């Protein structure tokens, strides 16, 4: 439980940088823009997670279906094993049934 | 986001302060102090 004996360097974080000032600026692009673009298109990230949300099993299933043809050998094997384990646990284990 | 306890020193000391006047290892070891302090209370 030994704790450090010196003051850590105080992080000089500013609230008025470019990212913090323009955070989510076009969140209402559709509503205020005569609908052409959903707020889905502003999400940057993995291809299988743009404008989508699910639990671990659904996320693994979607990843395997979408980008499973470009995964490495061990990555695909790990994804398959994780899918199998999640299927078994979710469909056969738990309390509330 | 990995979270770890940083005030464990004070958490241990809050119990160890009530066992300073004991005899044996009960005044030093936290495992033997929590049981002795509860019996004391």
């Amino acid at each position: 439980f030994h704790v450090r004996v010196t003051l850590p360097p105080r992080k000089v974080v500013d609230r008025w940088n470019e990212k913090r000032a323009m955070f989510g600026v076009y969140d209402n692009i559709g509503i205020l823009g005569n609908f052409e673009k959903h707020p889905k298109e502003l999400i940057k990230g993995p291809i299988w997670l743009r404008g989508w949300k699910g639990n671990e099993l659904q996320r693994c299933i979607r990843k395997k279906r979408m980008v499973g043809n470009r995964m490495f050998i061990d990555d695909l094997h790990n994804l398959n094993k994780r899918i199998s384990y999640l299927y078994k646990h979710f469909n056969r284990h738990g309390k509330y049934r | 986001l990995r979270s770890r306890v940083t005030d464990r020193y004070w958490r241990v000391q809050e119990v160890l302060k009530h066992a300073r006047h004991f005899r044996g290892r009960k005044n030093r070891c936290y495992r033997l102090a929590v049981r002795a302090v509860t019996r004391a209370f």
Partner: peptide, 26 residues
Amino acid sequence: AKKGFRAAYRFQKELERWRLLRCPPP
């Protein structure tokens, strides 16, 4: 390395207490 400032500040207070107890100022 544990991220945080509260623990460091609290231990600084503890160190000041120990120093005062060891060497009582006139």
